[PDB]
């Protein structure tokens, strides 16, 4: 649940994409950016801007919050 890097975040969001089986372009098209950009994010999350991140995040119908099982 708690997330600590760009890669962990990218991975979790890729999975959310998939579980709604959307595709990279379904997404890109929903918000109006080119599908590369989504691909560049899922594959290379480190240099994505926050503006772009919050777009993709709106596409997936998610928000984010800030925070402070036996194995």
């Amino acid at each position: 649940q708690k997330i600590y890097s760009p890669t962990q975040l990218a991975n979790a969001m890729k999975l959310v994409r998939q579980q709604n089986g959307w595709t990279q372009s379904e997404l890109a098209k929903k918000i109006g950016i080119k599908q590369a950009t989504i691909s560049n994010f899922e594959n290379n999350p480190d240099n994505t801007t926050l503006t772009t991140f919050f777009k993709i995040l709106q596409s997936l119908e998610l928000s984010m919050t800030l925070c402070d099982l036996e194995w």
């Binding site: 991975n11 979790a12 999975l15 998939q18």
Partner: peptide, 11 residues
């Protein structure tokens, strides 16, 4: 969780 961070959870 992923089996490895090199094998992200995916479908």
């Amino acid at each position: 969780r992923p089996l490895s961070l090199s094998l992200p959870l995916q479908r």
